[model samples]
Target: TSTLVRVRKSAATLGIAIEGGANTRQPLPRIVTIQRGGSAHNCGQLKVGHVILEVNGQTLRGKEHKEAARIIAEAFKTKERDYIDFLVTEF
Candidate 1:
């Protein structure tokens, strides 16, 4: 249950492709694919089965698709911070 990975994805690219409307039984924000040459793809630790549990220290355990997307998107839009941390886990 401790199989968690914290990833830093620069504001330049945030293509850790995730699908919405996830079933409650399955992992939320199912990571389908990592963008080619993207920050996530470069991380080399994230994969399809991993579930995003946190973003920039905030939790996303029960958030909706757009809610999670907005939270994650905001991290990539700020001018102060250069990167954001994505806390992911594998079930």
Candidate 2:
């Protein structure tokens, strides 16, 4: 079993940053930064090193890093109760 983290954009904070590199034709999103006092950080709960799997019930599966980031950022725009979901798994 794997841990699934649901992060809601709280108070002008996406709460996370990602690191991406060239490996292949894949998004390969990795958590490189979790902001202090932010959603992803969430008081030191979330961690790093998982390829981004899903966001907002949408499968990012093999999405490019840039596209995925854009999607995540955009998702917060809808303001649907001020929350977002993130799914990830090991490499």
Candidate 3:
């Protein structure tokens, strides 16, 4: 089953990093980092290679890595919320 990762927002970051979704785009966007003591790390569910399917109710399918990162980072700003949701599956 897929996991819904709820991350509390940080003023400067969401605390999770992503990779893949490059020009070739065969692998899709996936989590690559979880900052220490940050919201993502605090949740304890996110890990490297967890494929990111969506964020803040928006789809990440077919997006580039940069675009995917933008979606995640900007989610807190656009939604103006203290928490963000990431729909991800084990990879």
Candidate 4:
């Protein structure tokens, strides 16, 4: 599949930071919704208001909420316009 541009933002404009891994059974940075026209949206794998419970098989457990946000921000940075898959939990 071709890499798709999810969110359009500048590096300096990015609001989140990368803090690293957190010790937990669920994914970090509980994702509430996939941005419209984002990679997840294109893949048809993520839905709005979905709670992200894990990432890359790792569960979110130990990190602070800010920490998770940071991690996600970092991941977005590395992508050169591509779809990234994430395991999420919804209630």
Candidate 5:
């Protein structure tokens, strides 16, 4: 199943770390870490096993490493907003 996870951005920090999604072996990026006292950790919706399906409104499924980083960075690169919307799937 998929869930919409809204996380806060502080100083452009998403409070989450991801790995995998660059190579065909992995395919999709998975949540590997969450910062303590950060927006993602505080949200309580995202977990370690959750895969990042989308960032903002962009699909991250088939994106390469640099592409995925660019998409996610573009979403929270500005300080105009305090929250970012993410579509996440549980494995």
Candidate 6:
């Protein structure tokens, strides 16, 4: 299967809601957190309680993880900053 297809399926399985090709809520903190010395931590990109809000101008709340993951992976591929902002909202 194509990489995009696989990513879509994975995101769906994770119960991530996609709307207009974006995530319906911010990316989960668990998706970003890493154990000490982990590859992501080593890179200083992953953090506990951190949620990914946007990527390359694409909002994260309504996107599938696979799609978001692909975007993030692509950003990293292009040597772009892999930074995303966060906001807290009451449920």
TM-score for all models, in order of appearance: 0.76, 0.74, 0.80, 0.50, 0.85, 0.43
Instruction: Give the winner by TM-score.
Output: 5
Whole-model lDDT for model 5 versus the true structure?
Answer: 0.80
Candidate lDDT scores, in order, read: 0.71, 0.67, 0.76, 0.46, 0.80, 0.39
TM-score of 6: 0.43
- lDDT over C-alpha atoms for residue 77 of model 3: 64
Q: 1-91 in candidate 6: lDDT tens per residue?
A: 1011111111212222222334435543224334443334443433344455555455556566677667655544442333323231222
Model 6 root-mean-square deviation: 11.6
Ranking by lDDT: 5, 3, 1, 2, 4, 6
Q: Where does the lowest 10-residue lDDT sum fall in candidate 5?
A: 7-16
Supply the global lDDT for candidate 2. Answer: 0.67
Encode model 1's per-residue lDDT on 8-85: one tens digit a residue: 554278677777534455536778888887777766777887777887788888887878888878876667756667
TM-score of 5: 0.85
Q: What ranges in model 4 sit over 4 Å off?
A: 1-30, 79-81
Please list the residue runs of candidate 1 whose C-alpha ends up more than 4 Å from where it truly belongs after superposition.
3-6, 9-11, 21-27
Better of 3 and 6 by lDDT: 3
Number of colliding residue pairs in each model: 0, 0, 0, 9, 0, 8
Give the per-residue Cα lDDT of candidate 3 at 42.
72
Model 3 Cα RMSD, 1 decimal: 2.2
Model 4 error, position 86 (Å)? 1.2
- Which is the winner by lDDT between candidate 1 and candidate 5? 5
